[PDB]
Design a protein around this ligand. Structure first.
Ligand SMILES: CC(C)CCC[C@@H](C)CCC[C@@H](C)CCC[C@@H](C)CC(=O)SCCNC(=O)CCNC(=O)[C@H](O)C(C)(C)COP(=O)(O)OP(=O)(O)OC[C@H]1O[C@@H](n2cnc3c(N)ncnc32)[C@@H](O)[C@H]1OP(=O)(O)O
Ligand SMILES: CC(C)CCC[C@@H](C)CCC[C@@H](C)CCC[C@@H](C)CC(=O)SCCNC(=O)CCNC(=O)[C@H](O)C(C)(C)COP(=O)(O)OP(=O)(O)OC[C@H]1O[C@@H](n2cnc3c(N)ncnc32)[C@@H](O)[C@H]1OP(=O)(O)O
Lengths: 567, 567
């Protein structure tokens, strides 16, 4: 994985912006507590064998002297190991916040929550990539920082310490054995992941014959069915997935061999290397004039060799985890590339859109879907603020395609388009959109709260806007202007359309779409809404099947879904 | 959980039927290798400290004497340790097979795969209750057998051995400290699972505001959208789920306290109790007149106290796992009771069904849906073998209720019914049912090839049956009478209906239902099928919307869907 490091650097520069920040501060703090954690671990090794030497030296003075050193130093030892884990966890959180604040300026920039989900197919689940995969990526880049550099400082320190303690060949025949036996064991157990997938395949298709029996049992039951679908499930279970007995038999024999040359013969090698200074009376540098320092020197060397040996089991596992980290940075870099692709207008684009006021002419503009299939050839019409348009047709596949192009939600396949910008086009579907929040932020949704007051507005004006739609009892009944509850369930039917009309009245757009929305609204207040929009100047694009709504539309556009149209 | 043991006993008698079987044999073998594993663990404790005493006694004779004992005994130690794991795994598999061969005799008895699915509501997913929860239950009843009795034999053995080695108060002040400090730690860390759910709630609703943004982005993008839905997700993240920082701060302080009184102060207590025979120079029974055998006695007592202390951490965890085992035996006993309930008929039954030949009369019998509704007040008609019946109506909700009652798939809501038993009623839906297996078994499905010969039939006759349906080229195209690949994909169209008609011809039932099946079959083939059925005498209950198919039905039944019928 050569490009994995190159891709990981780009993400790292996002999560470590400058050289003076808390993330840089935590990185130094963890590195300081990684070094000081190894010293505390060695100090326990040296002090621990001095409590034990004083116990069996039968001196109460030596036992008290070295037990009190342990008691005095354990508040500091516990501080080091536990403030290192605090620094790791805080770095995981700081990394996640740094990435999220970068993956959400690109995501929610112009229309990218929409284009990346319902206009391209690069990412199947956008949501799972911005909340779930971001958390696991950050939890693995500092996990690899710790799990790789923690059992590496002591590897260097124990090799440096076991040398000049059991000789240079001491922690080298242990390295040779742990590596040679590790490679041989891994090669020997090759058919473990080979028959793990076979078990998973047999498990996966044992649930299939069960699910196929249930979601299809209607026909199996009329004619008897059982005793034939019973032997189908039985054969998949009794015959197919009972290699577990062959899998269990292999794991027993493999376990019998890997528990000898990696668990008991590894210690036999450990005894041999450590015992060289002791079973050699002509050893000048080390023990030659020692009486009970032989005891402390052995268990210091014996405990160091055990920690040096078991640090490889954690540096090997850390390298294995790097493959998972390589998988995560692939999806993050894929998501980052996709977000940067759509932010420039990529996923088409030949046509030009020029922002104009009260001009919506579609002069020589096709109606191609984002794939490219043109369904309307020669759209050419203009309407002005003051004349309504009724859209007619059997709603096949083109009714909900002119609006998407109109709102710039879909690409323009050539031609010149004039229309107001995003803030003036309004679309009201059959079920209106209710916002997660209070009752006040359902009338003023696309506007915020702080910038709502600067428009010279008041809650009384919000009430009278909401009163014009024949809805004044909900405000008092629900709990007030700041009552927070789910408005998709606590509201059902006409009141949603009434609140949508109230929002439209409050915002006062230039053009509005009423696609099969006014279906549970009284006809008198419907005419009132039409008159209000006409007198204030809210042009409406009415889509309806009711024949009585044909008196407030100066123009009329019809789509057949076959290729032609009349205006 | 008093009844949990009572329920677990009933399941155990299923998986341990008699006192002479493999499960009894494995249970004794595991118990034998559980006792002999503790002896091998103690023998390593005693032998291990004799290699170390020989090393630092600087005698090569003692090092070789006790290293060769370790080398000679390590094939047997590994054999004992890995034959226990083999016995556990084999018991897990033998338990799963014993339960499955009991949960599938009750499941596939008469219509219970069908009744439990869409006639009861006790189990929502019966599929993941006979393959997935059965495996995890058996994997936990013997995991509890090992994980509870393994760190209990050594608990008794180490207490018996540490006593008379460091005195009776030795492994009692350690029991007192571990139990008392364990309770204090658990009580102190009460607000860990209390704020774990708060994090999960905040995590779960951070994914909600993301998913609600995606599955609803169509209307959001038509407004300006962002800067209002951007601050909704931001507030759920930046404000709400940063209790992690308060969760991280608590875990640092809580960890700082539990790493002192349970990790470093536990050893300080361990030093104090073990050291009593040594610093007491007047200890008469123990090492009063000994050489430096205090070395071997200390580390034998020191290693035993560490294994005795750490055997409690596994007996505590074993008890915690019992709660999960209590959950599993609830679903297994719930499934077992539902299986036994339906085998007699429960979920109704007022009417009586008496088997007969060629008569399907419905004198004074309603067609009630097995819920609290009735769609036909009283059906009353009879047909004779040889007279086809056409069923009319726009198949709303009553057409697919006469057939279910006819096949005994639904209960009889009073009245007297005469009809042939399960093997003679036939129902062919719009898409026929194809069976996992060869091409031969798609013609003879509810029969087996083993019982296919007892009818005096041959593959030539099967081909002849396949010839009458105007479909004979598929046999030699797919690979013969043994082509295995699934037939819901290779066949797409009228071939499935042709094979269903071939199966109908082969089985020669008394009555058959042709509910909207013949929709991709040429009219000549329809006439041939009807003529062949009339000649042989297979009465047909035809459901069709074609007016031309009205000349070969002596009778005619009409379900208007209002509550009455026309026969
Ligand atoms: C500073 C400079 C001067 C020099 C700097 C140079 C440095 C940086 C070099 C850096 C090298 C690294 C970076 C290179 C890595 C490349 C490699 C990763 C790639 C592969 O392709 S490689 C694939 C498999 N590679 C394995 O590496 C798995 C095996 N990894 C294991 O870690 C063990 O195999 C296991 C833990 C499973 C062993 O089993 P454990 O029992 O679990 O550990 P152990 O058996 O090895 O112990 C050892 C022994 O110490 C002795 N000992 C203990 N206590 C004693 C006592 N009281 N008295 C006397 N002796 C004692 C024994 O008695 C015995 O102790 P026990 O542990 O058995 O009790
Ligand atoms: C046979 C008859 C005569 C009598 C039969 C009677 C029997 C059956 C009675 C049966 C009792 C049972 C059934 C009742 C259970 C009821 C209970 C479950 C209900 C609760 O409501 S209870 C809720 C929490 N209950 C805990 O129980 C958690 C804490 N459970 C732990 O298990 C550990 O706490 C942990 C694993 C965290 C170990 O803690 P750790 O600190 O991580 O290890 P450790 O330190 O404790 O080991 C101990 C020390 O031995 C000394 N020792 C070691 N090496 C030495 C050396 N070389 N020299 C000298 N001394 C040494 C130390 O120095 C040191 O070990 P080292 O740290 O030195 O290595």
């Amino acid at each position: 994985d050569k490009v994995f490091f190159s891709r990981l650097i780009q993400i790292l520069k996002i999560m470590v912006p400058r050289t003076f920040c808390k993330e840089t501060g935590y990185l130094v703090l963890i590195a300081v507590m990684l070094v000081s954690r190894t010293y505390c671990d060695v100090w326990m090794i040296q002090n621990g064998t001095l409590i034990e030497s004083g116990i069996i030296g039968r001196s109460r003075k030596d036992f008290k002297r070295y037990l009190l050193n342990f008691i005095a130093a354990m508040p500091l030892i516990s501080l080091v190991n536990n403030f290192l884990k605090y620094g790791l966890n805080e770095l995981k959180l700081c990394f996640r916040v740094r990435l999220t604040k970068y993956l959400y300026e690109e995501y929610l920039q112009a229309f990218t929550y929409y284009k990346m989900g319902n206009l391209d197919n690069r990412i199947a689940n956008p949501d799972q990539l911005l909340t779930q995969d971001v958390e696991k990526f950050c939890n693995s880049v500092v996990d690899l920082y710790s799990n790789l550099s923690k059992p590496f400082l002591d590897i260097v320190l124990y090799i440096f310490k076991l040398t000049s303690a059991i000789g240079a060949q001491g922690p080298a025949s242990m390295m040779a054995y742990l590596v040679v036996s590790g490679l041989f064991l891994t090669r020997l157990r090759r058919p473990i992941g080979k028959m793990t997938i076979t078990e998973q395949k047999y498990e996966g298709e044992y649930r299939y014959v069960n699910s196929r029996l249930i979601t299809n049992s209607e026909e199996i039951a009329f004619y008897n069915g059982n005793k034939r679908e019973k032997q189908t499930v039985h054969s998949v279970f009794r015959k197919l997935v009972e290699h577990l007995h062959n899998f269990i038999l292999f794991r027993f024999s493999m376990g019998f061999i890997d528990s000898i040359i990696a668990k008991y013969l590894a210690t036999v090698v450990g005894y041999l290397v450590v015992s060289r200074p002791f079973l050699d009376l002509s050893h000048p540098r080390h023990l030659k004039s020692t009486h009970s320092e032989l005891l402390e020197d052995y268990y210091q060397s014996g405990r160091m060799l055990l920690r040096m040996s078991q640090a490889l089991g954690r540096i090997v596992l850390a390298g294995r985890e790097m493959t998972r980290l390589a998988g995560f940075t692939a999806r993050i870099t894929e998501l980052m590339q996709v977000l940067k692709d759509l932010n420039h207008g990529k996923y088409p684009g030949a046509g030009e859109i020029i922002i104009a006021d009260n001009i919506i002419k579609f002069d020589h503009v096709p109606l191609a879907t984002p794939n490219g299939d043109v369904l309307i050839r020669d759209l050419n019409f203009e309407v002005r603020s003051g004349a309504n348009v009724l859209i007619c047709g059997p709603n096949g596949c083109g009714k909900s395609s002119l609006f998407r192009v109109l709102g710039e939600l879909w690409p323009l396949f050539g031609g010149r388009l004039t229309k107001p910008e995003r803030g003036k086009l309004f679309y009201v579907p059959q079920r209106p959109y209710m916002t997660l929040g209070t009752l006040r932020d359902q009338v003023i949704y696309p506007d915020g709260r702080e910038d709502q007051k600067r428009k010279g507005i008041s809650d009384l004006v919000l009430k009278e806007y909401l009163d014009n739609v024949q809805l004044g009892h909900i405000l008092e009944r629900e709990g007030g202007w700041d009552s927070v509850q789910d408005w998709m369930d606590v509201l059902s039917g006409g009141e949603k359309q009434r609140m949508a009309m109230a929002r439209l009245f409050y915002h006062k757009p230039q053009f509005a779409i009423l696609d099969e929305c006014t279906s549970a609204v009284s006809v008198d207040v419907e005419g009132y809404i039409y008159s209000h929009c006409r007198k204030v100047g809210i042009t409406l694009f009415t889509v309806s099947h009711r024949k009585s709504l044909w008196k407030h539309h100066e123009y009329y556009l019809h789509m057949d879904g076959r290729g032609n149209y009349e205006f």
